[PDB]
């Protein structure tokens, strides 16, 4: 009977919560209080990328840390040469209402989708030289919120259908569906090994998934509201999570717990997008209030602010080289930030 | 700058020229979001404008007086609206279609309208109210088993406004009902917005051909209001 299952669910929830509290010997803030604080991080808009006709939802750096897709609700993907600001490609989209894109780690493919539940895979390395749709991954029953390539043949997808799916692009079929969420899945970060991923899903829960096992291994639930953004820490053992609750939270996979909350009283709006730096020492979070804050992930201090956008920030990619953070906004502009010494 | 780097800049400029032609089309096109419950008959508004001029979004593109309108009916999405609705910041309007006859779901439609209206990302987006199924409202008021005052105790206090221009042969009970439903949406419309966005009620039926004309006129008077506000004229 439902009441007995509800009581068993509450009991197991209390067992999980007790095991977490039992392994909460000390907070991250206590361990890092001896660390010298990071100085005032200043980043200086080394590039502004212009050509999108509308809001940008998403970006993704190439592994080359030089090419950059951004998806705009104009209905264009643009491939940017960041070093030159050159447009490498502008890809017309069948649906304007794009909400995610991913650049493949090989750079052979780019993916995008949105309010049309298709995940379109675009082949950049085409012998005809035009970019073309290689596969329309159709079978999602709600909007495509995040996509990330594991390999040129495999993409994991997240949807407004409270679901994730791994696809084999050769077939266009879900090789695994991930179905333990209850809200709209909003963001997806692949682990550095690409064996695990975390997704945050409008239920204030993050879930760790095993790509091969098809199963939820951990649910992390420190957030108060919709996790809009998720990013693995570069060690792959922790990940950060930006919420509508105006807080970022860092979760360790293994301690199964929130390590720190990144919040300040002056900040009362949702975190739109999250990325770590290459060391993990800098945690960058984009906000609805038109700017991106930099957090000391260890000390939870605002090391700085990227205050250069005019409309809602929407996406936030750090290069795999760490040489820059790119910031996209609803103002159609696409800003690349480093600093100087 | 090397010969290849120069030629890549020239490709970037070729792309920027195509993107400018697309800027011309994107600004010449007016984008609309069509919202409404399963009762609303938004599907019939679509069918009208389609004929006469697992997919998650249904574009309808129609033209009135050489002006291109793209109207997006939300397709196969879940009933959790709050995330995908943020895509429609920078539409010209949201056409909110209401089933005026469905009093038990009229409060549901009012809470939807109030949520759409008060959303941070729609704070600048005006709403075209299609109060639809007005034939069925007239029938339900004349064949008056269903009493609005059972659902809206304000209706017993409400009196038809001097604004009201009922069609000839309309019973004043049908007028009082339909204008009450309108003012139930307008009391939401008028409670916040600081003039950044406005609400444009229309009484509609499926048989109406003039819904495209209504949308044309409302989009005109929205862009007019926006510019007159930018010019400190309104």
């Amino acid at each position: 009977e439902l009441d007995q299952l509800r009581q068993e669910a509450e009991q197991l929830k209390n067992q999980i919560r007790d095991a977490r509290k039992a392994c909460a010997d000390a907070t991250l803030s206590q361990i890092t209080n001896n660390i010298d604080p990071v100085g005032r991080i200043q980043m200086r808009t080394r590039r502004t990328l212009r050509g999108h006709l509308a809001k940008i939802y998403a970006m993704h750096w190439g592994t080359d840390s030089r090419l950059l897709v951004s998806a705009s609700q104009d209905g264009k993907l643009i491939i940017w040469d960041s070093y030159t600001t050159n447009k490498v490609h502008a890809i017309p989209l069948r649906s304007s209402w794009v909400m995610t894109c991913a650049y493949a780690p090989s750079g052979n493919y780019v993916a995008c989708g949105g309010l049309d539940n298709i995940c379109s895979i675009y082949n950049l390395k085409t012998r005809e030289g035009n970019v073309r749709v290689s596969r329309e991954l159709a079978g999602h029953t709600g909007y495509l919120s995040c996509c990330r390539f594991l390999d040129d043949n495999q993409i994991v997808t997240s949807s407004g259908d409270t679901t994730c799916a791994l696809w084999d692009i050769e077939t266009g079929q879900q090789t695994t569906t991930f179905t333990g969420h209850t809200g709209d899945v909003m963001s997806l970060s692949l682990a550095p090994d690409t064996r695990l991923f975390v997704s945050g899903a409008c239920d204030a829960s993050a879930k760790l998934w095993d790509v091969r096992e098809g199963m939820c291994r951990q649910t992390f639930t420190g957030h108060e509201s919709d996790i809009n953004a998720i990013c693995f820490f570069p060690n792959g053992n922790a990940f950060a999570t930006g919420s509508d609750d105006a807080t970022c939270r860092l979760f360790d996979l293994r301690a199964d717990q929130e390590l720190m909350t990144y919040s300040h009283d002056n900040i009362i709006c949702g975190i739109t997008s999250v990325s770590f730096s290459k060391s993990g020492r800098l945690l960058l979070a984009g906000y609805d209030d038109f700017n991106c804050n930099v957090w000391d992930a260890l000390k939870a201090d605002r090391a700085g602010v990227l205050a250069g956008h005019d409309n809602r920030v929407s996406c936030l990619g750090v290069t795999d080289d760490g040489m820059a953070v790119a910031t996209g906004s609803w103002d159609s502009f696409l800003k690349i930030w480093n600093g100087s010494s | 700058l090397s010969a290849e780097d120069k030629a890549a800049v020239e490709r970037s400029k070729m792309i920027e020229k195509q993107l400018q032609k697309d800027k011309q089309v994107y600004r010449a096109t007016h984008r609309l979001l069509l919202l409404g419950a399963d009762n609303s008959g938004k599907s019939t508004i679509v069918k009208q404008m389609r004929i006469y001029h697992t997919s998650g979004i249904f574009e309808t593109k129609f033209q009135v007086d050489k002006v291109n309108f793209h109207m997006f009916d939300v397709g196969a999405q879940r009933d959790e609206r709050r995330k995908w609705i943020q895509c429609f910041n920078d539409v010209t309007a949201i056409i909110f279609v209401v089933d005026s006859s469905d009093y038990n779901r009229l409060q549901e439609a009012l809470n939807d309208f109030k949520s759409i209206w008060n959303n941070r990302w729609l704070r600048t987006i005006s709403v075209i109210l299609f109060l639809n199924k007005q034939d069925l409202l007239a029938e339900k008021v004349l064949a008056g088993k269903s009493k609005i005052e059972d659902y809206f105790p304000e209706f017993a206090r409400y009196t038809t406004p001097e604004d009201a221009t009922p069609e000839p042969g309309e019973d004043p009970r049908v007028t009082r009902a339909k204008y009450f439903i309108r003012d139930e949406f307008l009391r939401i419309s008028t409670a916040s917005g600081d003039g950044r966005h406005y609400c444009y009620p229309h009484f509609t039926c499926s048989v109406d051909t003039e819904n495209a004309r209504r949308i044309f006129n409302d989009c005109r008077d929205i862009i007019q209001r926006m510019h007159l506000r930018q010019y400190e004229l309104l």
């Epitope: 491939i79 040469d81 750079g107 030289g129 | 090397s2 030629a7 890549a8 020239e10």
Partner: single-chain antibody, 230 residues
Framework: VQLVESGGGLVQPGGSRKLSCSAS????????MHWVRQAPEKGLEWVAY????????YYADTVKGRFTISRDDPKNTLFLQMTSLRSEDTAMYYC??????????????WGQGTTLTVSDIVMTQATSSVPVTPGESVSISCRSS???????????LYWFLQRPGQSPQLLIY???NLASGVPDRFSGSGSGTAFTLTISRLEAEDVGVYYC?????????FGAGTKLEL
Amino acid sequence: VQLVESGGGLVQPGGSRKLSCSASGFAFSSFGMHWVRQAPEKGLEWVAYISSGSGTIYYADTVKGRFTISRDDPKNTLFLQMTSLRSEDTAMYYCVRSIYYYGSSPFDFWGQGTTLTVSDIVMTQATSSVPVTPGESVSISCRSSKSLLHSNGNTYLYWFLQRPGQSPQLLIYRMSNLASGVPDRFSGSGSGTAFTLTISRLEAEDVGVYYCMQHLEYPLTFGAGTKLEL
């Protein structure tokens, strides 16, 4: 992808021919196009370039005042209107596509060529021919007057194979990048002023003339070519 060239034939000195190159199976408008010619027993020589959308045109000084390169993107076709033709212009003319963006491969497809019979950096391939055996590892040297290493870091040597009856095929672009269809047998390296193409396990399909080319600055220049003889 197909490029097929027409309008060659016999013509008198002083005469004129319009070579027409017709493009099919690729986005012709998006490619810059080149004409490269080959005198009957001589190396490649670049003739003319027309950018995507015609915004840039360049010629060799041997043709600069006297050939004009043009394209009809709607008809997917390229023209070389030649005038004041000379014995020097007696050559196989190859229609060559190029696309230019970060990571592009210029010169990645060459048409079958049209033969016309009329009745600046130096690239040195110091060996005109190497006698070779199958399965041998062979290195083809090339030298440039100027260092092709540009400050953008692209070391810039191109490598082509022309097989005895085929048009040239791009093997490697910008010193070291292997072309999409080309076996991993091929690998290129160099300093910027001096270069090698290694061919790690020669097949019979690797016989032909190997041309190095620079794309640092126009006019584009080709080496004399190194023949490999099985």
